[PDB]
Design a protein around this ligand. Sequence first.
Ligand SMILES: [Ca+2]
Ligand SMILES: [Ca+2]
Ligand SMILES: [Ca+2]
Ligand SMILES: [Ca+2]
Lengths: 88, 88
Amino acid sequence: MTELETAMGMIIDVFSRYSGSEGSTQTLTKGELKVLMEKELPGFLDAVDKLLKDLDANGDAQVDFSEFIVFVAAITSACHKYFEKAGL
Amino acid sequence: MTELETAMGMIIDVFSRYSGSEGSTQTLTKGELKVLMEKELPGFLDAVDKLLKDLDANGDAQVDFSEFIVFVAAITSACHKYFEKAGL
Ligand SMILES: [Ca+2]
Ligand SMILES: [Ca+2]
Ligand SMILES: [Ca+2]
Ligand SMILES: [Ca+2]
């Protein structure tokens, strides 16, 4: 497994660890999202419900994997853009 | 560092390992992309130039981090969707 394939497997791993405690095992409810954020993105965040509403693209009140990975990408892109600029 | 923060750091790590051999150190030329694909996503891919044209959102003939992470997300989402469906 390459470094990049491992990173991709790791995001999927993270998602699956929190999406199975209630409702669909393929999505995050507001409660599951609250736990995923405090455990995986501590300090990033009222806030949890607004986050869910921001990420929910199809209006089912849950965060599925597509919605979640778009969020992970955005955060990662913001980090990379910041050090790119600190760079001069 | 959490599991998810580590995965994000790992994608940034992967990108930086290949974007520094030519031209801007913040982007991938077609040559750098060819090397990144054979080393990090072997077997995924003519093909390299078409891939670059597909990912290049701003028309500079290079893949920057935003373009790259959108690609990583898409591949990861496609993997997760596949096993979600194999699931019944
Ligand atoms: Ca769930
Ligand atoms: Ca949704
Ligand atoms: Ca470069
Ligand atoms: Ca570009």
